Amino acid sequence: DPVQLNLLYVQARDDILNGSHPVSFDKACEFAGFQCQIQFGPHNEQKHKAGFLDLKDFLPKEYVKQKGERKIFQAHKNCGQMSEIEAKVRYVKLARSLKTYGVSFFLVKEKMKGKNKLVPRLLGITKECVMRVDEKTKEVIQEWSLTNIKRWAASPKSFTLDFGDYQDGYYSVQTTEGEQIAQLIAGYIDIILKKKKSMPPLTSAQQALTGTINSSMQAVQAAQATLDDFETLPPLGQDAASKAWRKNKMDESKHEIHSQVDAITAGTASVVNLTAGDPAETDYTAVGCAVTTISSNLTEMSRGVKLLAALLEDEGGNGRPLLQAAKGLAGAVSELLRSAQPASAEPRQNLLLAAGNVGQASGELLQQIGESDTDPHFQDVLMQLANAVASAAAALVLKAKSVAQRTEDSGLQTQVIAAATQCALSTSQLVACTKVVAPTISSPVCQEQLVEAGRLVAKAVEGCVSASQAATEDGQLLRGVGAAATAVTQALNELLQHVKAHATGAGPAGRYDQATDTILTVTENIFSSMGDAGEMVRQARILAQATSDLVNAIKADAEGESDLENSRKLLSAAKILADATAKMVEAAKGAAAHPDSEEQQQRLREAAEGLRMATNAAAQNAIKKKLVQRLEHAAKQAAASATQTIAAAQHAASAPKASAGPQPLLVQSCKAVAEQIPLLVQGVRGSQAQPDSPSAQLALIAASQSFLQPGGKMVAAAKASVPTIQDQASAMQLSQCAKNLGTALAELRTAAQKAQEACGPLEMDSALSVVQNLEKDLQEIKAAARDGKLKPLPGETMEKCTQDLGNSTKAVSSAIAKLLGEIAQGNENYAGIAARDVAGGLRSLAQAARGVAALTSDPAVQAIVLDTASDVLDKASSLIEEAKKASGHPGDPESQQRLAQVAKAVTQALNRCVSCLPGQRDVDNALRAVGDASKRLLSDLLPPSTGTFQEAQSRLNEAAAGLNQAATELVQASRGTPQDLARASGRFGQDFSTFLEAGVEMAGQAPSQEDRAQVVSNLKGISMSSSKLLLAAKALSTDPASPNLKSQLAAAARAVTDSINQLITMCTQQAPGQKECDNALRQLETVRELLENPVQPINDMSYFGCLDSVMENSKVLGEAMTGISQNAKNGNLPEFGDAIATASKALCGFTEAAAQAAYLVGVSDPNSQAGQQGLVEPTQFARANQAIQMACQSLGEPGCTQAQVLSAATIVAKHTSALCNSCRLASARTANPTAKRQFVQSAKEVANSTANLVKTIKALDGDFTEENRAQCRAATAPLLEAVDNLSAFASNPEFSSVPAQISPEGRAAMEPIVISAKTMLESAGGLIQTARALAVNPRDPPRWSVLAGHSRTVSDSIKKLITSMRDKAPGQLECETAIAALNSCLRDLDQASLAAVSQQLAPREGISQEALHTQMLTAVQEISHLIEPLASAARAEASQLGHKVSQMAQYFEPLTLAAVGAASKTLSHPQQMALLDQTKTLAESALQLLYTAKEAGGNPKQAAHTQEALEEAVQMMTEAVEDLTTTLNEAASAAGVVGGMVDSITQAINQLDEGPMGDPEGSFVDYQTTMVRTAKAIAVTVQEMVTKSNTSPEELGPLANQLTSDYGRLASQAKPAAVAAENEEIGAHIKHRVQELGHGCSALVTKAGALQCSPSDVYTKKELIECARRVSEKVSHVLAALQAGNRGTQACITAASAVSGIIADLDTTIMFATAGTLNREGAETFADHREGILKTAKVLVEDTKVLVQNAAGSQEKLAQAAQSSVATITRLADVVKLGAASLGAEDPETQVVLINAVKDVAKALGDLISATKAAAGKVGDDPAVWQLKNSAKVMVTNVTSLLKTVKAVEDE
């Protein structure tokens, strides 16, 4: 039947060629073969070539352009010329068999999983099937049957499909034809189913608020009841140091009490503001965020008052009025909440009246405290001004009401009625809010509420004016506006008057204050704007007149003053400025002459500095004093916004009490700050007392600078706690407090630095002042010691005083090393910092010493430690006063010696003071017993009586196990009471001397007497190892609970067990024949104790490492037992013992590797938390010190032989070089700037000593001269002193070893490994003894029976332990946990997506759309902050991976929950669908990462096929967060809200301060080339913002976003720029300018958005413009500090920008040359242009020569060189356009090449400039320098080509 076959043929051709049928190109090539077989017939090979075959009508139009024409031709030969009807049947059957038959196809964009991307998929629809088919292959990738669909959907652009059953997840694909697909699939599934056919009710939100206030109210009264009872207070007595604590807690409470009453007032306003909205519109959660704030801070007030009140009662003051104040406040708070409940329907006045009481009530409470900053008179101003604003309100009410009579239209009548009514409540609302906020106007948050209410009345006023417009063209409008204008003016009066009290250090100002302040602001520009000549002089102008006004004013003042003596000093000081002013004036004129001389800018500055000082010389001291009140009001501000967050954790985080997750790292973090505040506020009150004493100002600076780092960690922790918290009300109360604290820190870091430069230098006598004050204080204590009644402080115990006193001395000893390192470096300003540390520790030590005495009992015991404490003070006091005395002249050799001589004494003093403590005792006895034993051990050990040479020496080893037993006691005693540890040491002490006596007696018993020197050295090595082990025990005696110290004692015990082995190997006798077996038995005893409790890390090598280390040790122990066993049968003793030593080394390694396997698994438990591993490894550092000093100790004895001489160099140079590297790695990871300088300096001292010593050891090589040996002895001292110094530096407690915390259940998972490990030694231990006897007798059945019995038990422990190790596999349990938790989070979205697709997603009514995004944001921010630490763990270490993933999961359900809501509120359906989709991608990628991490498992052995997957996974998600974070920020900008923008700044300021500084990629130049370019953007943007304010204010949103984003970039490169700059001063300035730019933008952007919510306000449109100038100025400063880079130059950059601008100017000439407009003027000749060019051109090349020759040199000359270059080109640019015009545009093409010539020449100049920029501060043979000459020649060749070019166009 050919007719139907031909019709099938034709219709299949239709279906395929139009593209309606997906067919791959190859299959389409067979189709085209059929085509030619039929319509071209049997094709001829010769004639059927390309050229006559039309592809478009011969192939599907999608594959016609694939142009495989000859490929299609061999497809024709493939089909050949075979029969046409069989060609027809092959055509039809090849079309049929393809799975894409019988099914329509659609191009639908599908979303790849893992990216916010879209790819085509030709989705296939079948009568029975749903199939996804790839676009390219045209082949099925996946298949579904119809019967599984359950609910499809239609969207204007989407077609969502679901299955639910087979894959957990649905099929969402967008397409413009979703409607037709939906109806078609509906019909298809209908057919498939028919085949198998047979107002009192509250809004749901209000319930939540109702409970929260109910929950709060219950907490309220409970707090209220506790008030009435004066509970207690610890007894402290009359001690002056105690009395200080009595004073401090009171004052601390005074600040503690204030912050909450500051919070309570602020919260109440938030209720008042937010409730005023229409119900069904308000943010109840915010009210919850308010009421919880009201309640949570209500109760910490209750704790505070009682503590204060009790303190008041020991004083004569009666606490009764205080409590009466508290209870009065308490009820007022409560009575408010009664009107807060949405159920109660009281009139609105009740709420407003209730709040006013709170402010009224909270007023007198502060009046009882006396802690109110605001003036009482100022409150009345607010009181009346509010009424004054209220007064104008009444006026507009009447006039608007007057319009009501004028009004005529129904409804439009009441609209004006409505508007006026709204104002009346609004202003009354303003009246109440102002009353509420009255007593706490100081805090910012109170102020930020007041303006909102002030904004609210302003908008309502504008509404009334709009309402008045509804009337008809009468004077009522004019008189209405005249009423409105007063109301807005009154509001402005209320707010500016409001802002005045915001920053007021003191009320009175003096006389010259307004003059004084002016110079500061402008001097500040002068210091800031280094590197820009124009700015400095420009300010120098405005300064010089301004200070002259002071000069004039004081001059008239002296005239007015009548006393001649004072009239002198007024004038006398006045002259000092006059000299100072002119000195600046002339210097200013000097730098003006030389713009680019970096010394002149230094000159202009340095005059300005004394200029400030000269104002201090004048009677007003404000230049210095004012900069303190900008700190005293900063510290209190941060101190409050700390104690308002500290409480905001206790209440809110108590709800879960979850031991996993982020909470337990929060409360621990909050601990540090909670004790830092009392050190801060106590300082602030110190400055408030004597502002005229520079010591206090340094203290306030000292405290504030320290505060930041402990404080900062809270914020980066709290922002990581926000999502997990479940009770939304207590959640938001945390984030808002964290953001406030976040700001109040960046405004501390700034205001601190100002104080640092302004404040006078430490002069390292404030330390002398403090120690002398301390000297007298403890003298009173020593005087009060005989008084016999000294009571301890509240918080310390005998076991607690020591662990700091023990720590304190190690700090001071470390501190003193700082001082010496600095003084040798020469009288730095850090040298003053060192005196601070030494003083600072001395305050700690003295305070600790006072603590012990007050707690210890016996007065004679008491008195002695104070003496050695007092001895430390006086001895160290001599050092400090000597340090400054020796600081006068650097480079004096006796100075370092006289310093060190005293500096040795202070260390000698401290060690005495530590031991003088009687608590730890009698260890001194043991060490001295060892030490005194060393003296007779050091000298000529000779046997007075031989006894038995062989037997008594053998008898010695029979006593050897006792000393080994003696040591193993100590480590056991390390787990008991400190008194108990004395016993084992005491028994060890007697054990050492007793065993040493038998040691020394038979030491000289050996025949050879050269062996006598060996055996004493053998006893030496045992001595020091034991001695230092006791020295290790000396440490633990003062710090019991610290596990890091306990590990060091175990390591020291390992020192002796090897050291005792050192004797037995060679010197002792093998008469028993098994001496190595005891070495096995002794080591087996010692290794056991190390495994006994692995609380702290035993090694650095990680888990999978210790798995292999165990794995290899398993095999060797398998081999070793074979080795010893068979030799026992052979009875061959020497080879029998050989495998023993390897076995023990296998055992010692194995148990260490097994102990590490314990600690690792122990940490991985989710509850536990790890440590930071420190900087200097206590294990490796200690022996590194030991080995080096052991080496030089050997050369100390007179007899130097190449046997010991050459070995000494090898052990020294191998270790001392390594010891240097330890500092260098640590120094780059430190955060203390002092440590960086000190580590480098000290590490080089050994290197200098190394060079001196290595020369001498080479000088002694082959000479052996006594002086050559003596000069080796002399050169020993520098290295030993240097290493001891550096070691003394490292014992600072802050540097290393925070002990990781292990959960109980964390210990649970550890025991299975521990138990099996323990018994293996037990099985081994009994197996060891079997070997010794069996070496003698070849066989004995019971002995050889237990030999196997233990060995399998040895084996069973080994296999069972390994079984646990591989099966436990840390990191692959919680990954499964997270994945499931993650995978469900995906499911919700996929359904929630579907619900919105058909428009069913119901908007949750509790929350406003703005708040959802904020949560949806802080959720996302945390995720991206954890990406890299997770990608780190998945590579190297598993223990950390255990905790990280569990953190990256818990952020998701709080996100997805928010995301479903987030898209629910949004109205435009395309927005909500995408808002979810990008979120859906985020989890999807995150899941992909988690899979790889599981496979990564923290395994170093996984190959690149797995390793690459990790990295390529991170990138898919890292850019995913970037995709989402925009979609929120941007959507948070269209709306007027500005949050996050005001946060990403206040954070990228703090991120700028802390971290590692190690010079990542890039020079200081290639930073400065981009960083400046970025700096321009935030400049071009603010001027792009000013214009929009007048023109079209609705666009301020995205601009403010584009601002704060770029300031992110300028923040990122800043610190790497600072570190890579040559001079620290250049670096620090590039930072500090960026920061002082930060506070500018935050103020800018907050206004910027606020305008968008009042687009036609007039007074906010002012402060925008004024602030917009402030940032633009600051950019000029940070640009100026960027010009302080002598490396590279703005001359390099600006020229390139300018010459490109000249190219753009040439392009404008090119536009005219192209347009032909550029015509000739008059009869201008050409030689004028040519010759003018001729000079410039040859001037350019000479300028080029001076330019190129300056690639190495001072910035100044190359600056003019570039400035000459820019001059040459622009002068050339002037003449060329004149020259080009000289031909006229009648011959434009002649002009074109000419202007194109310079267009190319100027380009070459820029390339030369760009090469010049890259070629600066270079070596003579740098790869760029030849690149310079090439570019130089490029200029040379182009200009000559230019010269000829014009020379040839002179004619036609």
* Interior angle at CA 774, CA 773 and CA 775, nearest 5: 90
Domain co-membership, 1604 together with 1718: no
- Report d(CA 1125, CA 1137) in Å as an integer: 10
- Asked if residues 537 and 592 have their Cβ atoms less than 8 Å apart, the reply is yes
Sorted by sequence, the CB contacts under 8 Å of residue 528 that are 6+ apart come out as 1633, 1636, 1677, 1680, 1681
- Among the three residues 850, 875, 900, which one is the final residue of a domain in this structure? 875
Domain co-membership, 174 together with 284: no
Residue 1215 lies in a domain: yes
- Indicate the Cα dihedral angle 1621, 1626, 1631, 1635, nearest 10°: -160
Domain co-membership, 1683 together with 1820: no
Residue 904 lies in a domain: no
Dihedral sign for Cα atoms in the order 209, 210, 211, 213: positive
- Asked if residues 1119 and 1125 have their Cβ atoms less than 8 Å apart, the reply is no
- Asked if residues 1428 and 1448 have their Cβ atoms less than 8 Å apart, the reply is no
Q: What are the two backbone dihedrals, phi and then psi, of residue 160, each rounded to the nearest 5 degrees?
A: -90, 135
Give every strand in the sheet of 104-110, ordered side by side: 140-145, 129-133, 119-125, 104-110, 171-174, 158-161
Domain co-membership, 1542 together with 1524: no
Helices (H), 856-1009: 859-887, 893-916, 923-938, 949-958, 960-973, 978-1001
Phi-psi region of 797 (alpha: psi -120 to 50; beta: other; left: phi over 0): beta
- Report d(CA 946, CA 955) in Å as an integer: 13
Residue 1115 lies in a domain: yes
Dihedral sign for Cα atoms in the order 453, 458, 462, 468: positive
Dihedral sign for Cα atoms in the order 1329, 1334, 1337, 1341: positive
Residue 1547: how many other CB atoms lie within 10 Å: 21
Sorted by sequence, the CB contacts under 8 Å of residue 1815 that are 6+ apart come out as 1751, 1822, 1824, 1825, 1827, 1828
Residue 712 lies in a domain: no
* Interior angle at CA 1010, CA 1005 and CA 1013, nearest 5: 80
- Asked if residues 1050 and 1089 have their Cβ atoms less than 8 Å apart, the reply is yes
Q: Which of 1253, 1313, 1241, 1314 is nearest to 1279 (CA)?
A: 1253
- Asked if residues 1571 and 726 have their Cβ atoms less than 8 Å apart, the reply is no
Q: Under DSSP, is residue 109 helix (H, G, I), strand (E, B) or coil?
A: strand
- The type of residue at 1807 is D
Domain co-membership, 1235 together with 1307: yes
- The experimental resolution of this structure, in angstroms, equals 3.7
- The type of residue at 152 is W
Domain co-membership, 1111 together with 1074: yes
Interior/surface letters 1028-1065, b for 16+ CB within 10 angstroms, e for the rest: bbbbbbbbbbbbbebbbbbbbbbbbbbbbbbbbbbbbe
Number of domains in the chain: 8
Sorted by sequence, the CB contacts under 8 Å of residue 1162 that are 6+ apart come out as 1094, 1095, 1168, 1302, 1306, 1307, 1309, 1310
Residue 1689: how many other CB atoms lie within 10 Å: 25
Residue 860: how many other CB atoms lie within 10 Å: 7
Dihedral sign for Cα atoms in the order 1708, 1714, 1715, 1719: positive
Sorted by sequence, the CB contacts under 8 Å of residue 1426 that are 6+ apart come out as 1444, 1447, 1448
Q: Which two tokens stand for residue 1123?
A: 């080795």
- Among the three residues 857, 875, 893, which one is the final residue of a domain in this structure? 875
Q: Which of 205, 323, 308, 220 is nearest to 267 (CA)?
A: 220
Residue 900 lies in a domain: no
Q: Which of 99, 198, 196 is nearest to 147 (CA)?
A: 196
- Asked if residues 1327 and 1175 have their Cβ atoms less than 8 Å apart, the reply is no
- The type of residue at 99 is K
Phi-psi region of 661 (alpha: psi -120 to 50; beta: other; left: phi over 0): left
Q: Which of 1474, 1463, 1391 is nearest to 151 (CA)?
A: 1391
- Among the three residues 1687, 1718, 1740, which one is the final residue of a domain in this structure? 1687
Q: Which two tokens stand for residue 108?
A: 């639908």
- Asked if residues 433 and 354 have their Cβ atoms less than 8 Å apart, the reply is no
Domain co-membership, 1785 together with 1667: no
Q: Which two tokens stand for residue 1167?
A: 């509850």
Q: What is the domain-level CATH number for residue 1140?
A: 1.20.1420.10
- Report d(CA 752, CA 1636) in Å as an integer: 12
- Give residue 716's Cα distance to chain centre: 8
Q: Which two tokens stand for residue 461?
A: 């006023």
- Report d(CA 286, CA 278) in Å as an integer: 15
Interior/surface letters 5-23, b for 16+ CB within 10 angstroms, e for the rest: eeebbeebbebbbeeebbb
Domain co-membership, 50 together with 115: yes
CA atoms within 13 A on the CB side of 1094: 31
- Asked if residues 1538 and 1645 have their Cβ atoms less than 8 Å apart, the reply is yes
DSSP per-residue letters across 195-245: HT----SPPHHHHHHHHHHHHHHHHHHHHHHHHSS-------TT-HHHHHH
Phi-psi region of 396 (alpha: psi -120 to 50; beta: other; left: phi over 0): alpha
- Report d(CA 334, CA 269) in Å as an integer: 15
Dihedral sign for Cα atoms in the order 1420, 1424, 1430, 1431: positive
Rg over alpha carbons for the chain, rounded to the nearest Å, is 43
Interior/surface letters 310-319, b for 16+ CB within 10 angstroms, e for the rest: bbbeeeeeeb
- Report d(CA 989, CA 932) in Å as an integer: 11
Domain co-membership, 1118 together with 1228: yes
- Strand ranges for 757-825 from DSSP E: none
Q: What are the two backbone dihedrals, phi and then psi, of residue 120, each rounded to the nearest 5 degrees?
A: -70, 145
Residue 172 forms beta bridges with which residues?
160
- What's the domain range around 6? 2-195
Domain co-membership, 164 together with 191: yes
- Report d(CA 1318, CA 1091) in Å as an integer: 7
Q: Which of 1693, 1704, 1709, 1672 is nearest to 1792 (CA)?
A: 1709
- Report d(CA 1269, CA 1198) in Å as an integer: 8
| Count of residues making up the chain | 1852
Domain co-membership, 1355 together with 1393: no
Residue 381 lies in a domain: no
DSSP structure class, residue 1404: P
Sorted by sequence, the CB contacts under 8 Å of residue 1467 that are 6+ apart come out as none
Domain co-membership, 212 together with 162: no
Q: Which two tokens stand for residue 75?
A: 């497809």
- Asked if residues 1521 and 1425 have their Cβ atoms less than 8 Å apart, the reply is no
Residue 431 lies in a domain: no
CA atoms within 13 A on the CB side of 1188: 28
Determined by cryo-EM
Residue 1496 lies in a domain: yes
The most distant pair of C-alpha atoms in the chain lies apart, rounded to whole Å, by 135
Sorted by sequence, the CB contacts under 8 Å of residue 1204 that are 6+ apart come out as 1194, 1195
